[PDB]
Design a protein around this ligand. Structure first.
Ligand SMILES: [Mg+2]
Lengths: 170, 167
């Protein structure tokens, strides 16, 4: 891959897969329709936090990583962030279900699939099993302003809500 | 593929998280371990049904709930293991089990890693998902084998149909 650092442009043609939340499909046992989400296009005029993690329903990810972003969402929005998105290698059906498991509604946090971890692979941040690694990006109108890969699979620090917040608070 | 009278293949290993009370919550994750199906099923009567994926429409609305409802009849016919199989990793299969309010081993929610078992019998699709199918395995021997004619077609692998082939 290529790695990403602050000051880099967000790559072009980045496409994720997801199921937009809807009231009719609010039950976790109800499935919606997966569609493409063109992050490069959607995020051109937005300030975005993208955090990736080993997978939906994994231990650290489920116990700390996603709950902390939910808890900090009001402060994150207070700092001008338009989109918060979690990313993993799981398909859109699973990411959708995970959003519901975490009692997220609307688009408060986007639960996005990186199909075959292809985006994460393209920047060198996927692991040997084809999972995305744990990392965070802050992308402000197409420019990377924060980028951190965790030093280990089960280490949550540089991609945490609280840490990303510190960098928005500057 | 497989057919009635075939032996269940050797060295078949799935991945799963055994349900436990302390991890009962969908947001509480256990740790995947290997499930040596060939070894475990040698002296048991087993239903294994595979499907395109956890949290997929037909699988979630009909395929799994119908097995859940028929569990008492299934057990009354001498079946020792009921397992659902999909290409999702064990974390996802585990959560799906909780989403369906299944506990213990009433139905096992099993991962076919990279659909490798399903590929080995030629019953995986071009995206690497398992197809929708069912096997009844009785002490290591296949007594029923069904592959659905399409991804969203539920008939020969349904609980009703498998129940009618439990003689
Ligand atoms: Mg017919």
């Amino acid at each position: 891959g290529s790695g990403l650092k602050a000051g880099d442009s967000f790559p072009s043609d980045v496409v994720f897969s997801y199921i937009p939340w809807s009231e009719d499909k609010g039950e976790i046992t109800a499935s919606g329709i997966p569609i493409n989400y063109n992050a490069s296009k959607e995020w051109a005029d937005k300030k975005v936090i993208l955090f990736a993690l080993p997978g939906a329903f994994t231990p650290v990810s489920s116990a700390r990583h996603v709950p902390e972003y939910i808890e900090k969402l009001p402060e994150i929005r207070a700092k001008g962030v338009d989109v918060v998105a979690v990313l993993a290698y799981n398909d859109a059906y699973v990411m959708s279900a995970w959003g519901k498991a975490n009692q997220v509604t609307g688009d408060d946090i986007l639960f996005l699939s990186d199909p075959d971890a292809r985006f994460s692979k393209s920047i060198g941040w996927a692991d040997e099993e084809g999972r995305t690694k744990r990392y965070a990006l802050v992308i402000d109108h197409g420019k990377i302003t924060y980028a951190a890969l965790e030093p280990a699979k089960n280490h949550l620090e540089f991609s945490s809500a609280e840490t990303v917040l510190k960098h928005l608070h500057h």
